[PDB]
């Protein structure tokens, strides 16, 4: 019933809602349109948009776009597309750059109130002074000179980086971040949304609260990196309430949840850019990646992603999440909705000496535990392919599959036993085998049942598939902090096998998610699969 599970945040909202602190609840999701979103961002998406719906409130999608150098509209697009794919419906699609004129008016007021000033000092010198707790020489400049200099910065008289505007708070403040933090910088560079209008851009610490305030956000939800940043957030709110058309009340407040860190995966933009550019991975939608794009392409359903996020909870509890966990939620999400078909990944041929012609078998798509009914014609014939790995000349103790004195059950059809093994070049190339005569939907006459069941497909009927077998992207549980990050890659992240799958798949809609028995879950890769050249990704293996 509650999309977001119980925690400090639900409680806090519920309290303030009931006590009339705010009329409606207003969250935002605010990413930077300068990259693609990943599984970590999903936590912020489910949280922020989830509360809006859980409590009959609003949630804005807003591109926090104050860094013109890197930011592109295609990232804005991609962001909106992944947000909706997760199933969420932003109340508004907003861009912080539409706020600039208001933010600039706000800076004027700061300066008229003697609350900001222009700093001519170079960057290196400014941080030595901050480190020393000393004031800029320029700090006690006048309202008049500051407005003229700020205007001269607006005009783009000064080059990129050369002057900045800073609030006047306390140069010796114990919170280092309150030492006259920077409000405005100079970048002679055009913005993807608003163009060549501005040469002065605000810093995060100043624009973010103001975007919040402007939108009447009630609960601005951020991850825990903004711990010491909270004090400046309040400072901007408090010195500007009821100014330049801002409300005097109510006002937004920050609250902090733990960012997701998932085992076996890196989420930092730096490292991700590394992997794409250096061709370690094929592209931003690569199913090896934890981008939302890549998880989509992989076959993961948005419902598993939401559920994953929901399942794991919202807290201050920055404990790393095990990939085991994620994999199990995918498996669980696909269990009742993935019809079971049969395909072969490492094909090995088996010829049946005591069988001729064809015959077609009603086979169930759903196992006993799944309430769905559904059936399909499964072709059988004297030539099949089985997994190479379901055959031993030298089987171990447990061996439940096919061997030189061990019968086996072909799933949904006959028991066969081995008769001859043709070898060529040391390794095995074709099985010669026999059906045990009355074993279609029945045991052998002699009572010695087959120890196990293996999957198979008719070599006379089956479709070629390119299988893209995905694993975790790293071997080590902790790649994101571990030292050599590229030395921890899993060489098995992608194996590509050429294989076979039963012909029925051809009569299914392209977006079907299948369970290949004893193999894992699978679906047509949305980019490269074609009906005449099938390509299927393994979404996840079995438990
Ligand atoms: N792994 C994660 N788990 C939870 N939230 C995240 C994660 N990564 C990013 N977010 C949050 O989603 C929002 C937008 O993400 P985006 O990456 O554009 O912002 P950002 O400026 O890179 O944030 P950060 O610098 O904290 O990663 C931010 O609130 C951000 O902290
Ligand atoms: Cl049928
Ligand atoms: Cl069976
Ligand atoms: Cs940031
Ligand atoms: Cs069933
Ligand atoms: Mg960042
Ligand atoms: Mg980022």
């Amino acid at each position: 019933m509650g999309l977001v599970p119980e925690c400090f945040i639900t409680e806090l909202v519920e309290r303030d809602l009931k006590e009339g602190k705010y009329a409606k609840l207003v969250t935002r999701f605010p990413p930077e349109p300068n990259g693609y979103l990943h599984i970590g961002h999903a936590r912020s998406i489910v949280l922020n948009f989830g509360l809006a719906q859980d409590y009959g409130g609003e949630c804005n999608l807003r591109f926090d776009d104050t860094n013109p150098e890197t930011e592109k509209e295609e990232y804005a697009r991609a962001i909106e597309e992944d947000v909706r794919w997760l199933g969420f419906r932003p109340t508004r699609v907003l861009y912080a750059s539409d706020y600039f004129e208001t933010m600039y008016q706000c800076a004027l007021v700061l300066i008229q109130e003697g609350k900001a000033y222009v700093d001519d000092l170079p960057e290196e010198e400014m941080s030595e002074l901050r480190a020393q707790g000393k004031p800029s020489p320029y700090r006690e400049r006048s309202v008049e000179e500051n407005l003229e200099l700020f205007e001269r910065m607006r005009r783009g008289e000064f080059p990129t980086g050369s002057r900045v505007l800073r609030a006047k708070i306390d140069p010796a403040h114990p919170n280092f971040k309150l030492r006259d933090p920077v409000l405005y910088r100079i970048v002679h560079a055009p913005h993807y949304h608003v163009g060549d209008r501005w040469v002065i851009y605000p810093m995060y610490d100043f624009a973010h609260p103001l975007e919040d305030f402007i939108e009447g956000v009630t609960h601005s939800l951020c991850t825990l990196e903004f711990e010491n940043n909270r004090t400046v957030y309040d400072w901007v709110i408090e010195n500007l309430k009821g100014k330049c058309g801002l409300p005097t009340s109510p006002r937004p407040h920050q609250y902090e949840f733990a960012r997701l860190d998932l085992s076996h995966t890196v989420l930092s933009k730096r490292k991700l850019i590394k992997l794409v550019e250096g061709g370690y991975v094929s592209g931003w939608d690569d199913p090896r990646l934890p981008t939302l794009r890549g998880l989509r392409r992989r076959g993961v359903r948005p419902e598993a992603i939401v559920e994953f996020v929901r399942k794991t909870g919202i807290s201050r509890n920055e404990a790393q999440i095990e990939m085991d966990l994620f994999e199990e939620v995918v498996r669980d999400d696909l269990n009742p909705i993935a019809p079971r078909v049969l395909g072969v990944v490492d094909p090995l041929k088996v010829v049946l000496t005591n069988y001729e012609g064809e015959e077609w078998i009603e086979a169930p798509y759903w196992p006993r535990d799944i309430p769905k009914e559904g059936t399909r014609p499964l072709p059988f014939s004297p030539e099949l392919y089985i997994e190479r790995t379901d055959f031993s000349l030298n089987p171990p103790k447990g061996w439940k599959r096919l061997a030189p004195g061990q019968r086996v059950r072909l799933r949904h059809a006959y028991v066969i036993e081995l008769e001859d093994v043709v070898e060529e070049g040391g390794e095995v190339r074709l099985l010669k085998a026999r059906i045990v005569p009355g074993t279609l939907g029945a045991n052998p006459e002699d009572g010695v049942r087959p120890k196990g069941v293996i999957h198979w497909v008719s070599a006379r009927h089956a479709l070629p598939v390119e299988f893209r077998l995905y694993g975790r992207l790293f071997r080590t549980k902790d790649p994101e902090e571990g030292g050599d990050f590229l030395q921890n890659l899993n060489p098995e992240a992608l194996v590509v096998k050429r294989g076979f799958i039963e012909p029925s798949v051809a009569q299914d809609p392209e977006d079907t998610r299948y369970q290949l028995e004893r193999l894992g879950y699978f679906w047509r890769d949305p980019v490269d699969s074609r009906p005449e050249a099938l390509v299927m990704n393994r979404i996840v293996p079995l438990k």
Side-chain angles (χ1 to χ4, degrees), residues 32 64 67 204-205 208 225 259:
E32 313 187 281
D64 218 318
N67 300 310
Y204 181 74
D205 275 334
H208 196 84
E225 318 318 295
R259 67 163 50 228

Side-chain angles (χ1 to χ4, degrees), residues 358-367 369-374:
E358 81 183 28
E359 110 187 50
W360 289 87
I361 294 188
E362 187 169 5
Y365 273 131
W366 314 99
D369 52 313
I370 318 288
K372 284 161 79 57
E373 300 309 315

Side-chain angles (χ1 to χ4, degrees), residues 362 375-377:
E362 187 169 5
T375 246
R376 87 288 182 175

Side-chain angles (χ1 to χ4, degrees), residues 275 280 473-476 479 482-483 485-486 488-491:
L275 295 156
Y280 292 99
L473 170 57
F474 297 94
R475 287 189 304 184
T476 66
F485 120 80
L486 301 168
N488 291 1
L489 281 166
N490 169 357

Side-chain angles (χ1 to χ4, degrees), residues 311-316 318-367 369-379:
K311 189 162 216 135
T312 37
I314 293 306
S315 62
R316 287 127 171 142
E318 30 151 58
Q320 183 198 246
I321 310 301
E322 307 137 327
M323 184 65 88
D324 273 12
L325 188 34
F326 178 76
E327 288 172 348
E328 172 208 57
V329 167
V330 174
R331 287 193 212 109
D332 286 348
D333 178 75
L334 292 157
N335 179 46
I337 76 205
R340 281 92 176 130
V341 291
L342 271 27
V344 175
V345 155
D346 208 315
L348 154 75
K349 199 182 210 153
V350 183
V351 178
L352 307 163
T353 49
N354 64 330
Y355 189 84
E356 338 194 49
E358 81 183 28
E359 110 187 50
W360 289 87
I361 294 188
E362 187 169 5
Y365 273 131
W366 314 99
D369 52 313
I370 318 288
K372 284 161 79 57
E373 300 309 315
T375 246
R376 87 288 182 175
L378 191 59

Side-chain angles (χ1 to χ4, degrees), residues 409-413 453:
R409 168 80 65 190
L410 300 185
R411 179 64 164 141
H412 299 157
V453 194

